[PDB]
């Protein structure tokens, strides 16, 4: 039997509860620039002895697409595993190229929607900011909600501090942003949201930008590109904080 | 040999900024010639597919690829490109590998973004054979191989490309028992496609 | 109240109430005990006489599994038979795949996994029996005791049922004061008689020396010696 | 699929079973003159020598399938009591070479039985009226009598539905 | 065996042999090897014994199901497409339908006669005239010689007379004549004076 | 009915998962794991209430693989279920991918199973917290801990149980003042036992502790006689 | 807690199983007893014809029912299936003890799995095999007891008490089927609060006797 | 998904409510074309408008589908409809009629109101297009209950009642809109009753065009100066 | 069963359908917003009309059509009206998570036969034969009219009489079914001429 059902007001209750779970989640944000996308999030820890470097809240789906979440982490982990699986089997093995951001986002939304309409399963308690690049649509940033609804954004924030983060991004965001300025604005918005310690180990950033052939892992095939997604290391974030 | 039942041949060549694909029109039941109107070249936008081999499989794959490219265009809001379509054809042949289709496809087209010629073929091993000069398929593949290998030269103008490919097809078809009854040549450019029917031996 | 009407539900305390109610069902059963001796194990059980019309020696309660494992249980006797049937299937499958008879700890784990599985889903009920079982294998004598929760441990001596506490009071004294198989049978009879405070005493045992490691029932002269020792 | 704490799980058809044959009778009780009276098949054949007076259609289909299967498998007519088990309130009536004429209503055999809202009085009227020497004529007329307050099974005719106007006029 | 079809200016003419032969003897000499799929579509079929009629009745049932479902007469082009799908699927199934068909129809929306030849592999081809098996080995030369797209039904019937005479003269077996049916804007009719 | 099956409450909480967390403490035994320079040690309280028990069998430390060991906090039936599943997964990985499953891969796979129980309403979460320890072929000494919610993370050192906070406080103080720098696994075992004693304020006999040591190419559990030597060395 | 067969009560009882046991108390009494040589079933049928309370499984075994008759049909058909399988695979007359254990293990399934209900019928099985005459009592809970004699169904306690007092006697009845049947008919009598040739039913099996049922005139000489 | 004591299905009624809370959709069919419209709701500054998809989705070269309700369910319906439209061609080599695709979508929606273990789609749809080798426009509606109907003009979603009242007294059955311009004018006027527009015109021979923001701007300017 | 009774309520809210069978034919009549712009053939000789949830009627009609063709495919003989009614009734029975909220009038002729047939089915899956019947909203009133205007000993004799009785009962689309697969729906102007007269 279905666990997600329409209430007399027409709302889906479990979807509202999953959105509440998301609103309790840690703040994460993404900013779309003229020459890239930056998606950032802060990393709270279960203990000071926990090795936070083992958990990545920003994950690569395809070498040109990456996702960050807000809400329940295990749900995000399984949903990312499924997203990678489908991006490979249902698109790349068929067409020889990785799906564009729009189609992969549609497929993630499909996965999340099925949990909203199948019996014996609750909705995913996460919202995703999926940033990617593709040749025909360019850089794009999508937010995906527990219901499977997704919209494109110039900049956005999800989680606990989403309201203040979005109010700040509306003021800061503008056209002709270069990706370095987008990173700067992302770090400022994330600093204003984090009440704890703020450094390269409590913050996680990744960018969709220029192709990185050095990360390709091989040479000699001129037509292979190299990932556009790249996580900023702890030191790379720290050096930028030292110039904030 | 299922591919030899109906016969027919397809050849694709690359010119200067343009592509040509040509095929014979004969459909036959082995020795008996049935139809002179069975065109083996289909297009799914700006990308052309010539399919030789068993005629039922040719029709089945034409229907299947029309379906798949229509869905691709609806979902992606863009037309499928020659390279993406080559990958799609390769994967679709593989999905039936055990109990395969008895066909040899030939993709021909111009990539709309880069605007440069593309032709590709698929062999029995299923390996994509993307060629800079020409692809041949069908019963007269040997005749076509020698003919194209002698006549082809790089960077042919469209009017010279037409003559080269039409002569290659006509002289190979003349020496193949199961090929003939007319030929059609497509000259594919950035902006237009010209379809021509060739005068040839009707025996 | 509220969290105890289904088998798969945790209460706010983290306790599963249906399993605890199955334990209550176990507590109602007749007393059964197991004793581990230096080279074997001994099983005994209190069989209550419901009426004079029961044929007095043919309502056997102790069950053998394969040839070296003996099982005795208290609580819902049909559930004990169900568990023993599953144990026999497991032992037979092990012997089929591997020509060696199933080791006692391996058998204990198989039964524990089966019993615990009945505590996972709401569509099934926990076993209402705590099962003392054991035997002799390539590495000695082993004595185990399941609980409706699927929990089990190795024991030097085990008791369960309505008289489990009185029986444990004597098992502790046995372990403190010692116990060979011959003496083990008599002490098992003594413990059953003491804990009973009509019934038929049924005894069984598996020892490397005295049974060559095969599970056998106590009958005839040895049974009568155990009974008179208990009366003594 | 549950037991109560007390241990128990939580028209009018009249039949008379004589030694010359069984007789069944029913109140059609059409709702309106428009309803096709012919289509009220409230007495049905189960086998050549078995019929019943009444989920109904499905059960009757399975009963007919079982009876024909038994005939196919054994080249013999299914015993009514065996059919009751192997198979709405029912009156099952039929004949066999083991016990002859029978009528059943968990199934218990009856010499005569009534079902429906009139059962509670028809039972007393049957108890007062039924006797062993009834010939098929009196059995028919007594069916009609208790209805006021057709079909038959015979070794010669088998199960058949009635003629009827005449037997009413003879009442 | 003999299944012939000719498309003329206004109609489609299908001819099929009347004989049914099982082994040593001719069982029937009046068999009709055609099914009316639609009020204006007619399918002739030939091949091995049981498959022909089984496939024909299956196709007729499915086409009538489509027609009733959509309250619309499927065009001959769509009917031939469906028949080709069914043949092409079965050829790579456990038991293929080894059946060759000619589908002659009058497309009421285009107001044009249409003739399609489909072999047991699913090789659909739209033809001016058609013939399945060895029957084409004799009739195609006559049809190539005499066929004109502008013939009237009378001229097409005369050309079928010529083809059937040639088959009777040279082909070894006795196919007991042909049944000739005409598909037209007025529906399907049978020529008895043939 | 949001409190009886794994579905969201109006607060977005999954009360069944949170109650499964409560179950983990119901065995009332504490454990801690520390990483040495080249080995990992796990310490767990072996509380034995009954004199008739065979202490050899009372054990919450499992040898999942040649290299990986697992200590469980929670009911022993669920702990054994988890251990069996982890053993099966490690063997299947060694079969499919041709090399021993890494500790963190096993932790991720187990946390994914746990998350599945937290997503499918038919299945209840296991009331166990799993702590995997190994000396990884690449990453070296490793501690990974999985919880009923499907969350897992690597640790420098970790403790679990009713007095988890006290042990974690002691470890935090030591790590501030100082991995555990020792030259052989015996010294880090002695260090772990010492900090267990100090945090719990309770002396231990050879019967009160169960100890598992992860070294290169072997995870093994110390017998009571070895723990006796370790306690003697601490007494010195 | 009594709504389904899966729920334990806080006291550890399965209410549905106890309700199924109460279902048997609604059925008419049936009595069973045996010597070493012969085993007897005596049943009070109730009406309309008197429903047959005895069921024959084999020449060497048969049974009677108290409670819900459809459950009796199911269990008896399963028992036939097992006996036929034993004779099919081993040519071995299935022992009465093993048949009883098969019934025990089959019925216990319904008391643990959801979706089913316990069999609301209690059965008495008598048989003769290489071990002699046997008598088993089957209950909805799955429990099976091998007995010298017993009675089940409404008001069977009186017959059971009579059998308890008479046990010293009828165990000694070797090779005298008539005296055993007389003792059985006397025992069932104390459960009445009468017997007619059509109401009463009797069955017997033993060393020489294949399982036979007496109904009608056949039982007249024993009333 | 079970009957109420009064015979209504609770989940279907609540899905109808979910549709009623959804954003507006409107369509009018004239002599030669069908026009679909919706208000952008582009009041948010950071929404990426240039790549935001339109409400109107092509199912096939000759058919478009608009909807109001839950977007996620609408995408499932759209993908199923596209797959069926292509499958019909692959089976019988003709494109679907608008009636056939409407019936398929309605059957999909119905199946979820009767099958157990699933909830209804909270989406009502407007399906517009032209039949193969035909020139008369077709416009249809589907809603969660699984029933469908043909319309000369219709609106769904929030404020559907008001603009439907407007349409009833502006659309004339005897003299329907005669040109694309009049259809677009009427569609814009109907949407302006609710207080930026996207307009899609579907025309025979698979001609589907989204009117540019300047073109709707000119239409709105004409309508506004008419209002004065 | 409660769900079946609620399905009956859904049936009784639906628009009324009516049928009358005369000597030679069966006539089915049916009761059909400002901006908005029943009888389904199962086979060439059988028609089905329904009242209730329109959506469920499509499921039933599709299944009935599939069975009507499958019968011809398995047995040469086309379905009889009795057989199709029985099949539709069984299909309705089996679904009782929710029943079909539809009652159906099934009319037509048996293959190569000339006795008109009219049948009814209801959500419980009970079916019966009628000389004239109506289903749907206010079906009781119009049925009461039929009971007194329809005559069992002298039923309508011609298509005109059957259509007249149907129109009077309804007081509109009319479908006339006649042997040899003759099914025709009357034109609007014909129905208007009947109504005015």
CB–CB contact C59 G11 (8 Å): no
Residues of chain F contacting residue C150, judged by C-beta atoms under 8 Å apart:
77, 80
Q: Which residues contact D72 (CB under 8 A, 6 or more apart)?
A: none
The CATH number of the domain covering residues in C17-231: 3.60.20.10
Contact (CB, 8 A) for A235 and A60: no
The answer to whether H116 contacts chain I (CB < 8 Å) is yes
Experimental method: cryo-EM
**How many angstroms away from the CA of E8 is the closest CA of chain B?**
17
Distance from CA of D39 to the nearest CA of I (A): 6
Would you call C33 helix, strand, or coil by DSSP?
strand
Pairing of strands F218-222, E41-47: unpaired
Burial state string for C146-172 with b = 16 or more CB within 10 A and e = fewer than 16: bbbbbbbbbbbbbbbbbbbebbbebbe
> What are the residue numbers of the active site of C?
30
Specify the DSSP element, H or E, that contains D21: strand D21-26
- Nearest chain B alpha carbon to A92: B87
Taking an 8 Å cut-off on Cβ atoms, the answer to whether A170 and H46 are in contact is yes
Cα G119 from Cα G105, distance rounded (Å):
12
Report the Cα E24 to chain-centroid distance in Å. Answer: 26
Phi, psi of C146 (to 5 degrees): -80, 160
Q: Which of C14, C122, C172 minimises the CB distance to F23?
A: C14
The DSSP line for D61-116 is HHHHHHHHHHHHHHSSPPPHHHHHHH----EEEE--TTT-SEEE----B-SEEEES
> Per the structure block, which two tokens stand in for G22?
């109460």
Minimal Cβ distance to D33: which of I90, I129, I147:
I147
* I56 interface with H at CB cutoff 8 Å: yes
Residue to mutate among E36, E55, E57, E61, with most I CBs inside 10 A, is: E61
**Sequence-distant (≥ 6) Cβ neighbours of residue A155 within 8 angstroms:** A29, A30, A31, A32, A141, A166, A169, A170, A173, H46
Nearest to I92 by CA among I15, I1, I19: I1
Residues of A in contact with H48 (CB under 8 A): 32, 140-141, 151-154
Tell me A230's DSSP state.
E
Alpha helix segments (H runs only) across A24-161: 73-86, 93-95, 101-117
Residue reference for tokens 């000069």: B133
Any residues with CB less than 8 A from the CB of I63 and at least 6 apart, and which?
A: I88, I91
Alpha-carbon distance C164 to C147, whole Å?
13
Q: Which residues are within 8 A (CB) of H138 and not within 5 positions of it... i.e. 6 or more apart?
A: H29, H34, H97, H98, H99, H127, H128, H129, H130, H131, H150
Do E and H touch (≥3 CB pairs < 8 Å)?
yes
H-helix segments, chain B:
2-6, 55-76, 82-94, 141-151, 158-174
- Residue G75 with chain D: CB contacts under 8 Å: none
* CB nearest I132 (choices: D34, D39, D40): D34
Domain that holds residue D55: 12-170
Q: Which residue carries 């119009």 as its tokens?
A: I142
| CATH fold group of domain A13-242 | 3.60.20
How many structural domains compose chain F?
Answer: 1
Contact residues of E toward I, CB < 8 A:
57-58, 61-62, 64-65, 68-69, 71
Q: F touches G (3+ CB pairs < 8 Å)?
A: no
Residues of C with Cβ-Cβ distance to G160 under 8 angstroms: 51, 53
- Indicate the residue of B78, B83, B88 with minimum beta-carbon distance to A94: B88
Q: In what order do the strands lie in the sheet with H153-156?
A: H153-156, H25-29, H34-39, H197-203, H207-210
Q: How far apart are CA I186 and CA C187, in angstroms?
A: 101
- Touch test H–B: 3 Cβ pairs or more under 8 Å: yes
Helices (H), A119-213: 162-172, 179-191
Fold classification of I2-196 is 3.60.20
d(CA E57, CA E77): 19
In Å, how far is B84's CA from the nearest CA of chain A?
5
Q: Which of F116, F119, F180 to mutate to test the interface with A (most CBs of A within 10 A)?
A: F119
Torsion sign (Cα): B168, B172, B178, B182: positive
Residue C58 contacts by C-beta under 8 Å, 6 or more apart in sequence? G97, G146
Across the E:I interface, residue pairs with CB atoms under 8 Å apart total 21
Inform me whether the C-beta atom of residue B99 falls under 8 Å from chain E C-beta atoms. Answer: yes
Nearest to D28 by CA among D13, D16, D44, D47: D13
Closest H-chain CA to I56:
H110
Chain F nearest CA to C20, separation (Å): 13
Q: With contact defined as beta carbons under 8 Å apart, do B63 and H90 qualify?
A: yes
DSSP lists the bridge partners of residue A30 as A39, A156
C-alpha dist (Å) from residue D5 to C6, C128, D2, G3: 21, 22, 10, 10
Question: Cβ of I128 and D32 within 8 Å?
Answer: no
- Note the helical H segments in B117-157: 141-151
The answer to whether residues C44 and C70 touch, using CB atoms and an 8 Å cutoff, is no
Chains C and E touch (3+ CB pairs under 8 A): no
In 3D, which of H6, H145, H9, H12 has the Cα closest to residue I9?
H6
Looking up tokens 């009058």, which residue turns up?
E106
Domains of chain B: total? 1
Structural domain boundaries, residue F17:
1-236
Check: CB of residue D129 under 8 Å from CB of residue D145. yes
Domain that holds residue E119: 1-194
Element (H, E) at F134: strand F129-136
- The correct answer on CATH 3.60.20.10 for the domain covering H10-227 is yes
The CB-based long-range contact list for F9-14 (8 Å cut-off, 24+ gap) reads: F9/A17, F10/A17, F10/A20, F11/A17, F11/A20, F12/A17, F12/A18, F12/A19, F12/A20, F12/A21, F12/A22, F12/A23, F12/A24, F12/A125, F13/A21, F14/F118, F14/F149
For residue C189, which of C176, C213, C175, C205 has the smallest C-alpha distance? C205
Q: Chains D and I: how many Cβ contacts under 8 Å?
A: 31
DSSP of chain G: -TTSTTPPPTTS--HHHHHHHHHHHTSPPEEEEE-SSEEEEEEE---------EEEEETTEEEEEEE-HHHHHHHHHHHHHHHHHHHHHT-----HHHHHHHHHHHHHHHTTBTT-----EEEEEEEEETTEEEEEEE-TTS-EEEBSEEEESTTTHHHHHHHHHHHHHHTT--S-HHHHHHHHHHHHHTT-----TTTEEEEEEESSPPPEEE-GGGGGGG-
For chains B and H, count residue pairs whose Cβ atoms are closer than 8 Å.
20
- Extract the tokens encoding G38: 């012969």
Rg (CA), chain B: 16
Q: Which among A5, D102, H179, E173 is positioned nearest to G49, based on CA atoms? A: D102
Residues in chain A with CB shorter than 8 Å from the CB of H120 are 6
Task: Give the span between the Cα atoms of C47 and D97, in whole angstroms.
Answer: 52
Sequence-ordered alpha helix ranges (H) in H28-143: 71-91, 98-114
CB contact, 8 Å: F56 with chain C?
yes
Q: Cβ contacts of residue H156 below 8 Å, gap of 6+?
A: H19, H22, H24, H25, H26, H67, H68, H124, H125, H126, H141, H143
Alpha carbons H202 and H130: distance in angstroms, whole number? 8
């Amino acid at each position: 039997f279905s666990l997600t059902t329409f209430s007399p007001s027409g709302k889906l209750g479990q979807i509202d509860y999953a959105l509440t779970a998301v609103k309790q989640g840690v703040t994460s944000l993404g900013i779309k620039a003229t020459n890239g996308v930056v998606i950032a999030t802060e990393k709270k820890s279960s203990s000071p002895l926990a090795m936070s470097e083992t958990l990545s809240k920003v994950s690569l789906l395809t070498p040109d697409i990456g996702a960050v979440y807000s809400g329940m982490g295990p749900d995000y982990r399984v949903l990312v595993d499924k997203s990678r699986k489908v991006a490979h089997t249902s698109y790349k093995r068929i067409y020889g190229e990785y799906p564009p951001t729009k189609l992969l986002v549609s497929e993630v939304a499909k996965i999340m929607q099925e949990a909203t309409q199948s019996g014996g399963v609750r909705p995913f308690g996460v919202s995703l900011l999926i940033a990617g690049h593709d040749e025909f649509n360019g850089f794009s940033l999508y937010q995906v909600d527990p219901s499977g609804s997704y919209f494109p954004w110039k900049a956005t924030a999800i989680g606990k501090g989403s309201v203040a983060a979005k109010t700040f991004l509306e003021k800061r965001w503008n056209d002709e942003l270069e990706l370095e300025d987008a990173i700067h604005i992302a770090l400022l918005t994330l600093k204003e949201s984090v009440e704890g310690e703020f450094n390269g180990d409590t913050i996680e950033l990744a960018i969709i930008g220029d192709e990185n052939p050095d990360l390709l892992g091989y040479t000699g095939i001129p037509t292979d590109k190299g990932p556009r997604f790249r996580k900023l290391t702890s030191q790379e974030i720290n050096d930028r904080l030292e110039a904030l | 040999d299922p591919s030899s039942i109906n016969g027919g041949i397809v050849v694709a060549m690359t010119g200067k900024d343009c592509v040509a694909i040509a095929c014979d029109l004969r459909l036959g039941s082995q020795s008996l010639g049935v139809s002179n109107k069975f065109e083996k070249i289909f297009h799914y936008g700006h990308v052309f597919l010539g399919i030789t081999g068993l005629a039922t499989d040719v029709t089945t794959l034409n229907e299947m690829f029309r379906y798949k490219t229509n869905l691709y265009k609806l979902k992606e809001e863009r037309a499928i490109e020659p390279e993406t379509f080559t990958q799609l054809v390769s994967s679709s042949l593989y999905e039936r590998r055990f109990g395969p289709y008895f066909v040899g496809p030939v993709v021909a087209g111009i990539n709309s973004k880069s605007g440069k010629p593309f032709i590709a073929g698929f062999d029995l091993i299923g390996c994509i054979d993307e060629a800079k000069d020409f692809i041949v398929s069908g019963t007269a593949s040997d005749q076509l191989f020698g003919m194209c290998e002698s006549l082809y030269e790089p960077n042919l103008e469209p009017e010279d490309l037409f003559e080269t490919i039409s002569q290659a097809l006509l002289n190979a078809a003349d020496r193949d028992a199961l090929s003939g009854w007319g030929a059609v040549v497509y000259i594919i450019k950035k902006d237009e496609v010209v379809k021509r029917y060739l005068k040839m031996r009707q025996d | 109240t509220g969290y105890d009407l289904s088998n798969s539900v945790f209460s706010p305390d983290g306790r599963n109430f249906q399993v605890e109610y199955a334990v209550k069902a176990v507590e109602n059963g007749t007393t059964s005990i197991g004793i581990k001796c230096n080279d074997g194990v001994v099983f005994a059980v209190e069989k209550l006489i419901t009426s004079k019309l029961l044929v007095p020696q043919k309502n056997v309660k102790i069950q053998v599994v394969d040839r070296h494992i003996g099982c005795v249980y208290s609580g819902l006797i049909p559930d004990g038979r169900h568990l023993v049937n599953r144990g026999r299937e497991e032992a037979a499958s092990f012997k089929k795949l591997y020509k060696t008879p199933i080791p006692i700890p391996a058998f204990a784990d198989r039964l524990g996994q089966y019993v615990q599985a009945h505590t996972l889903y709401n569509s099934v009920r926990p076993f209402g029996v705590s099962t003392i079982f054991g035997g002799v294998d390539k590495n000695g004598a082993h004595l185990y005791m399941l609980e409706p929760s699927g929990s089990y441990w190795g024991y030097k001596g085990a008791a369960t049922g309505k008289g489990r506490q009185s029986a444990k009071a004597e098992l502790e004294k046995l372990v403190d004061h010692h116990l060979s198989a011959r003496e083990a049978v008599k002490q098992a009879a003594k413990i059953i008689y003491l804990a009973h405070e009509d019934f038929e005493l049924e005894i069984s045992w598996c020892s490397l020396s005295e049974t060559n490691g095969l599970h056998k029932f106590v009958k005839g002269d040895l049974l009568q010696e155990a009974i008179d020792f208990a009366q003594k | 699929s549950t037991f109560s704490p007390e241990g128990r799980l939580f028209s009018t058809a009249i039949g008379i079973a004589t030694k010359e044959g069984v007789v069944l009778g029913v109140e059609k009780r059409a709702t309106s003159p428009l309803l096709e009276s012919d289509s009220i098949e409230k007495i049905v054949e189960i086998d050549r020598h078995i019929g019943c007076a009444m989920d109904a259609r499905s059960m009757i289909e399975h009963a007919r399938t079982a009876a024909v299967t038994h005939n196919l498998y054994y080249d013999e007519d299914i015993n009514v009591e065996s059919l009751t088990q192997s198979v709405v309130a029912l009156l099952i009536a039929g004949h066999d070479a083991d016990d002859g004429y029978q009528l059943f209503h968990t199934f218990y055999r009856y010499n005569a039985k009534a079902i429906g809202s009139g059962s509670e009085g028809a039972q007393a009227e049957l108890l007062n009226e039924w006797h062993s020497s009834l010939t098929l004529k009196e059995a028919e007329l007594l069916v009609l009598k208790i209805l006021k307050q057709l079909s038959c099974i015979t070794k010669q005719d088998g199960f058949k539905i009635y003629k009827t106007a005449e037997l009413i006029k003879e009442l | 065996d003999i299944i012939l079809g000719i498309r003329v200016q206004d109609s489609v003419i299908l001819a099929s042999s009347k004989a049914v032969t099982r082994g040593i003897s001719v069982l029937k000499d009046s068999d009709d090897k055609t099914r009316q799929l639609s009020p204006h579509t007619l399918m002739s079929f030939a091949g091995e014994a049981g498959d022909t009629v089984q496939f024909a009745e299956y196709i007729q049932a499915n086409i009538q199901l489509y027609s009733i479902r959509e309250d619309y007469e499927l065009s001959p082009q769509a009917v031939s497409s469906f028949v080709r799908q069914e043949l092409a699927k079965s050829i790579r199934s456990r038991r293929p339908y080894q059946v060759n068909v000619l589908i002659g129809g009058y497309d009421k929306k285009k107001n044009k006669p249409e003739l399609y030849q489909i072999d047991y592999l699913g090789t659909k081809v739209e033809l001016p005239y058609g013939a399945h098996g060895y029957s084409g080995f004799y009739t195609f030369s006559l049809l190539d010689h005499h066929y004109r797209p502008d013939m009237t039904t009378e001229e097409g019937l005369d050309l079928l007379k010529l083809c059937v005479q040639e088959l009777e003269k040279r082909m070894p077996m006795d196919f007991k004549g042909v049944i000739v049916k005409i598909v037209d804007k007025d529906g399907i009719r049978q020529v008895d004076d043939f | 009915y949001d409190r009886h099956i794994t579905i969201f409450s109006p607060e977005g909480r999954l009360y069944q998962v949170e109650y499964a967390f409560k179950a983990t403490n119901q065995t009332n035994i504490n454990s801690l794991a520390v990483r040495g320079k080249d080995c990992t040690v796990v310490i767990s309280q072996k509380k034995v209430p009954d004199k008739l028990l065979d202490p050899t069998t009372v054990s919450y430390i499992f040898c999942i693989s040649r290299t990986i060991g697992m200590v469980v906090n929670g009911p022993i039936p669920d702990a054994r279920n988890a251990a069996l599943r982890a053993k099966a997964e490690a063997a299947e990985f060694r079969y499919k991918y041709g090399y021993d499953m890494p500790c963190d891969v096993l932790a991720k796979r187990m946390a994914n199973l746990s998350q599945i129980y937290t997503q499918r309403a038919y299945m209840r979460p296991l009331g166990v917290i799993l702590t995997f320890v190994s000396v990884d072929e690449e990453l070296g000494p490793s501690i990974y801990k999985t919880d009923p919610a499907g969350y897992y993370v690597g640790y420098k050192a970790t403790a679990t149980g009713p007095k988890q906070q006290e042990i974690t406080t002691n470890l935090e103080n030591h790590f501030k003042k100082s991995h555990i720098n020792e030259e052989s696994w015996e010294k880090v075992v002695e260090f772990a036992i010492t900090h267990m004693i100090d945090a719990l304020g309770t002396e231990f006999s050879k019967n009160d502790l169960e100890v598992g040591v992860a070294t290169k190419d072997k995870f093994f559990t110390l017998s009571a006689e070895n723990i006796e030597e370790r306690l003697v060395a601490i007494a010195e | 807690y009594d709504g389904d067969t899966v729920t334990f009560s806080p006291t550890g009882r399965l209410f549905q199983v106890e309700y199924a046991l109460e279902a048997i108390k609604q059925g008419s009494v049936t009595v069973g007893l045996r010597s070493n040589t012969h085993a007897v079933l005596v049943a009070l049928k109730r009406n309309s014809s008197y429903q047959k309370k005895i069921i024959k499984c084999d020449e060497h075994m048969g049974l009677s029912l108290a409670g819900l008759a459809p459950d009796a049909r199911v269990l008896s058909n399963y028992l036939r299936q097992q006996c036929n399988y034993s004779s099919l695979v081993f040519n071995r007359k299935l022992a009465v003890e093993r048949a009883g254990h098969l019934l025990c293990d089959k019925a216990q399934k319904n008391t643990q799995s959801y979706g089913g209900r316990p069999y609301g019928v209690g059965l008495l099985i008598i048989g003769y095999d290489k071990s002699g005459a046997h008598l088993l009592e089957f209950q909805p809970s799955g429990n099976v007891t091998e007995l010298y004699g017993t009675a089940i169904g409404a008001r069977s306690q009186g017959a059971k008490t009579y059998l308890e007092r008479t046990l010293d006697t009828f165990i000694k009845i070797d090779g005298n089927p008539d005296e055993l049947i007389k003792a059985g008919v006397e025992a069932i009598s104390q459960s009445l609060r009468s017997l007619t040739v059509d109401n009463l039913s009797i069955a017997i099996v033993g060393k020489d006797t294949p399982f036979t049922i007496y109904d009608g005139e056949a039982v007249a000489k024993y009333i | 998904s079970i009957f109420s004591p009064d015979g209504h299905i609770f989940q279907v009624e609540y899905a109808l409510e979910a549709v009623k809370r959804g954003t507006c959709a409107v369509g009018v069919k004239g002599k030669n074309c069908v026009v679909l419209g919706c208000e952008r709701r582009s009041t948010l500054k950071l929404q990426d408008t240039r790549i935001t998809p339109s409400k109107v989705s092509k199912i096939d070269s000759h058919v478009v589908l608009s909807f109001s309700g839950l977007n996620a369910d609408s995408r499932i319906l759209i993908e199923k409809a596209r797959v069926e439209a292509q499958s019909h061609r692959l089976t019988l080599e003709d494109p679907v009629t608008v009636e056939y695709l409407t019936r398929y979508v309605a059957g999909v929606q119905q199946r979820y109101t009767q099958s157990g273990g699933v909830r209804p789609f909270g989406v009502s749809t407007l399906i517009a297009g032209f039949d193969p080798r035909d020139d008369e426009p077709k416009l249809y509606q589907t809603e969660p209950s699984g029933i469908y109907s043909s319309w000369s003009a219709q609106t769904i979603g929030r404020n559907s009642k008001t603009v439907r009242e407007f349409l009833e007294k502006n659309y004339d059955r005897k003299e329907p809109p005669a040109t694309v311009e009049e259809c677009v004018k009427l569609t814009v006027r109907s949407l302006l009753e609710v207080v930026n527009i996207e307009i899609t015109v579907v025309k025979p021979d698979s001609d589907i065009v989204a009117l540019s923001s300047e073109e709707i701007n000119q239409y709105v300017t004409q309508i506004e100066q008419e209002k004065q």
